[PDB]
Amino acid sequence: DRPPVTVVGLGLMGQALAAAFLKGGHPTTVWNRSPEKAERLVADGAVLADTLESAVTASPLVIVCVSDYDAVHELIRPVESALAGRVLVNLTTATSTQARETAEWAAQRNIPYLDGAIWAFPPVIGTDGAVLLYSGHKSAFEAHESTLKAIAPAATTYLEEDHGLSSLYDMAVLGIMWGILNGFLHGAALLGTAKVKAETFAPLANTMISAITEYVTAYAPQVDEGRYEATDATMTVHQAAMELLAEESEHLGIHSELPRFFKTLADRAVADGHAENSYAAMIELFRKPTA
Amino acid sequence: PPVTVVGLGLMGQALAAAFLKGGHPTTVWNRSPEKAERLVADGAVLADTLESAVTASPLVIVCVSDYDAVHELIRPVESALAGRVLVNLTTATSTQARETAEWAAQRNIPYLDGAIWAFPPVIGTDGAVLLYSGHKSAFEAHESTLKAIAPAATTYLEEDHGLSSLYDMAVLGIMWGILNGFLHGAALLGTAKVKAETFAPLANTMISAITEYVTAYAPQVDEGRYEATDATMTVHQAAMELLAEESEHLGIHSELPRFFKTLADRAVADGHAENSYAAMIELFRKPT
Ligand SMILES: NC(=O)c1ccc[n+]([C@@H]2O[C@H](COP(=O)([O-])OP(=O)(O)OC[C@H]3O[C@@H](n4cnc5c(N)ncnc54)[C@H](OP(=O)(O)O)[C@@H]3O)[C@@H](O)[C@H]2O)c1
């Protein structure tokens, strides 16, 4: 019942998890290269650890959330022994090919591994907001689902045994994720010029931001399918509009690099043919590599 | 009451219904006239020329390619327009809405800068949402009628036209920012023999999911310090590599993320490595 758990790496993200556990019964031991950065967790009742092995030792579940698989690897190895016998959940961010590669390493060292992908932000962690995708040893997944739920109680979730995907998806969403932050921060810079509090702006954004997810679902079909007979609008429209946006930004006296880029693609896609086609067609351009 | 609309673009046609399927009897016309049928079959009123079309309603709605087009229409019907009231929904900049605004008042033609946020289907539904800007007086008069098209959120700003349009711009960028990430993302899982059909749902999940946290930034921007909570630039920075690294590895267009990084790189270079992705804004204040 709320069993123990050990988490490694105390980034903004690192620390957020610990609480979910701590602030979910699960007694949590924690360890981090530089240390110091803890108090609140310890104050909130955590256990700082002598060394890594000590930290590992002290729990059946080992969560690792750090910079990069490079880091990960050069932790594990030193405790590789101690890990066998315990399940390793890697939430460090990494590519398909990285997840896949680290998956193998553990199995070859007889360590049950899970490659989890976080879709939540420090705050969100522990809430019905947060959502994770894990992939790996279904046995292990089933085995600790409970404790795992602590962080994404709404959607602690598992995909088949191939790790690649969990991570792959992770990438996909990222980028989408940035795609927004950008448009928004840009849009905001825009209304910035008009002495408009983002506080003001955002709401309506988010209003329209919710509005779009609609059309997206419709587009998927077009890609899944083929002909990009347009429903929304032609590329050529979108294309022009980007100019305007660019034109706007420039006029306003703020970075215009973003939209101008957006156009170049439109331009390409158009150049490539499908000017009449829905923005769907853009996909064909992404299927097409850039080096 | 009656209503008249101009332009049978993708957008043009969509609206008709909202009107038609909202009482408003609609006598419209089109640049490339020779289309309606289904509309006319669904029971429209097709006028002959522009003035004819203007004549035939107290409210007149124009949605065409671009303010360039718009402008070179007005004159011909400029007579018929006085008395009626036109709401420009042709896609156009602040400074274009501004110019259209001026010209109108200077000919006592009542104008509104209106911003459509919906997709053909969505039009007329509690989904659709419109942002207008113009004369308080005018708003009251057809608020109810106006609601017909965006029954959830037919909505009005200060008197400035610029803004309605401005906002419009702000979003579309956001809007593209998505379509891209998605289409790219989709190409990504493409490689893994993954139907977009499959992918999209979760996209849309995350598509809804983020707008939340974004708002948490607004204060930081409105404020100053970008003390990070979420994640430092430097994190995002690394992640973008991976994404880029991913795409490349997988054998698909990589130019996009490679860009993302450069900015990250800049922002970092420009100090705020520790700061939330918020800080990126400061790079937008810096012109191209
Ligand atoms: N922040 C978020 O919102 C968020 C969301 C989803 C996913 N993530 C993922 O979570 C991970 C970290 O995010 P974060 O913001 O918590 O990162 P962070 O603030 O940079 O923390 C990462 C941790 O990695 C440790 N570390 C890794 N390799 C090390 C090494 N070789 N030597 C010493 N310390 C090492 C760092 O310890 P020292 O620096 O003290 O040595 C630090 O505690 C990343 O993989 C990221 O993709 C973050």
Author numbering:
A (entry chain A): 7 to 297
B (entry chain B): 9 to 296
What did the authors write?
Imine reductases (IREDs) are one such enzyme class that have become widely adopted as biocatalysts for the preparation of chiral amines. These nicotinamide adenine dinucleotide phosphate‐dependent enzymes catalyze enantioselective reductions of prochiral imines to a diverse array of amine products, making them attractive targets for industrial biocatalysis. Of the enzymes tested, only one IRED sequence was identified with observable activity toward the conversion of 1 to 1a, namely, I127F L179V double mutant of IR361 (henceforth named HRED1.0) that was recently engineered by our lab for reductive amination processes involving cyclic secondary amines as substrates. Substitution of Met125 to either Phe or Trp gave substantial 6‐fold and 5‐fold increases in reaction conversion, respectively, under assay conditions used for evolution, with more modest ca. 1.5‐fold improvements observed with the H250L and A100T mutations. These beneficial mutations were subsequently combined by DNA shuffling, leading to the identification of a M125W H250L double mutant (HRED1.1) that displays a significant 20‐fold improvement in reaction conversion, and a 19‐fold improvement in reaction rate, over the parent HRED1.0 template.
